[PDB]
Amino acid sequence: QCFLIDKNFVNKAVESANLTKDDVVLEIGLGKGILTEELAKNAKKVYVIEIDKSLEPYANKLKELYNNIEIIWGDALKVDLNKLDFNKVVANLPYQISSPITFKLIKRGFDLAVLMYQYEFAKRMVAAAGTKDYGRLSVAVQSRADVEIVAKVPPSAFYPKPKVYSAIVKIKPNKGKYHIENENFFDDFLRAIFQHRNKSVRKALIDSSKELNYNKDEMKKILEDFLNTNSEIKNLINEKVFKLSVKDIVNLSNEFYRFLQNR
Ligand SMILES: Nc1ncnc2c1ncn2[C@@H]1O[C@H](CSCC[C@H](N)C(=O)O)[C@@H](O)[C@H]1O
Incomplete structure (x- = not known):
């Protein structure tokens, strides 16, 4: 797992999420809890779905500083999101789950999501009609939401370092359009x-x-x-x-x- 270690990119994702103390944020994946902490500071409450129980020490330490964090230990692809009440999603996603999690989240619904993807995946998501990266994923996402790349994220922003760039993508569902x-x-x-x-x-x-x-x-x-x-x-x-x-x-x-x- 490649953890986001550059607070400048954490800040960019959080700022883009336009958080207030009336927002309830779902995060997928805990990591070191660097993103989690920023969400906790700014939102009413944060749910973190995390599959790896070894990361408990980070969770335990976080709940000592913040009273508005709830951890759900499990696989985000398996968890019944219908049973959770949140309006926003902010996450550095495990890239292997990118596609299924995106549609599962869109299906559940949200006001706004700010999500880290591999850069190529993100480019496909936002691709304009009639261009080389335009495809099924582009249409499946854009038909349900307005999507844009907020920032390109270099490997140096992570530890350990990924082999490719990532991207922060903003998703605003749009049923009426x-x-x-x-x-x-x-x-x-x-x-x-x-x-x-x-x-x-x-x-x-x-x-x-x-x-x-x-x-x-x-x-x-x-x-x-x-x-x-x-x-x-x-x-x-x-x-x-x-x-x-x-x-x-x-x-x-x-x-x-x-x-x-x-x-
Ligand atoms: N299917 C899944 N469901 C929930 N968490 C998962 C998962 N697959 C991987 N993870 C967790 O998601 C994290 C991905 S690395 C991202 C960590 C953190 N958000 C950061 O920015 O640094 C790891 O903590 C990993 O254990």
Whole structure:
């Protein structure tokens, strides 16, 4: 585990979290508790989910100085977040859990998250439509939240040192912006189309038709009829997957869902 030892980056993450004494913060991972302490100082209360019980000495020492820290010993991928009341998440994430934890947190919901990722992962998260790092992860995150890189973090900020850069990413959930009709279908639709990101949406959906539980002949006919509903759909499905904006992907999947339900 690479612990964050540079207080300048701790400060940047905390400042970006815009904390007040009315905020309740969830932290994933304790480390030496350098971030934990700053959260404790500034927030109403901090929950720390930590998998490694050997780190108890840091926890015990922290509770002697701060009365508003609660440790939950366990695996953050296993813990039922629904049973916790918090409005913000601030963490130097274990990079191996980056993807599942991000969606688990977004599913649970929060006002704002400020999270450390590997830099490449963060770049994919915030990638603009039609660019080389734009992909399924970009759309899955941006369709549900506004995301931005707050700072690039060098290996020297950590001990022991990682091999690559990290990034602080700010996440502000945004349900209204795009409005996903059906979460399950949208997830299936995203999987199908980004299995073939350089192909047209049409050709991607035919190739990955089994991801939506249709055979290739059914899907081809479906899209013939779907294309006949309006000219906007025609232009969208003929375009390359990675070139569609998040807005257009959400709208397209919404319309396709409705089309399929009526069929
Ligand atoms: N699945 C998991 N659930 C909860 N904690 C985990 C975890 N996997 C790793 N951890 C813990 O998360 C921490 C990651 S290193 C980050 C430590 C600290 N936040 C800092 O900035 O220095 C370690 O304490 C490690 O034991």
